[PDB]
Amino acid sequence: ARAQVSEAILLAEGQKSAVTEYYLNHGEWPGDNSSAGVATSADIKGKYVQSVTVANGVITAQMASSNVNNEIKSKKLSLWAKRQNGSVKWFCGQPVTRTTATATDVAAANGKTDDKINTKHLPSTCRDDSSAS
């Protein structure tokens, strides 16, 4: 499980440059994959990953539905960044959502627990809470 999740995190990290550069150039986060200049979400695939979706700067990877551990089939994790006075810090954990392109904070984006990869299956360094800062 964790081995599969760690490869999903690495794939999702491949979209960070598009998101960070957009923030650098616009002072706000990209609304979707197209505005970030990246491929459509279902075309960002890999080992164990069916899609990667950019939404207001949050990068959410969705695990594949087959050929993955039963307990993480089709579940999701997010990478997201927050301003910390000039620099930005990237976080990794359960799914989050940023409601607007300019919001500083994020909210948890659970799916009524359905989309959440269980914490036992997240690498120890990818357990950031939605409230992390």
Residue numbers in the entry: 29 to 161
What does the paper say about this structure?
In the bloodstream an unusually tight interaction between the bacteria and the brain microvasculature endothelial cells is established, leading to cortical plaque formation that results in opening of the blood brain barrier and bacterial invasion of the brain. This interaction is mediated by Type IV pili (T4P), long thin polymers of pilin proteins that interact with two endothelial cell receptors, CD147 and the β2 adrenergic receptor (β2AR). The interaction with CD147 is responsible for bacterial adhesion and the interaction with the β2AR induces signalling in endothelial cells. N. meningitidis PilE (Nm PilE) is 78% identical to Ng PilE and 100% identical in α1. Here we report the 1.44 Å X-ray crystal structure of Nm PilE and a cryoEM reconstruction of the Nm pilus at higher resolution, ∼6 Å, than any T4P structure reported previously.
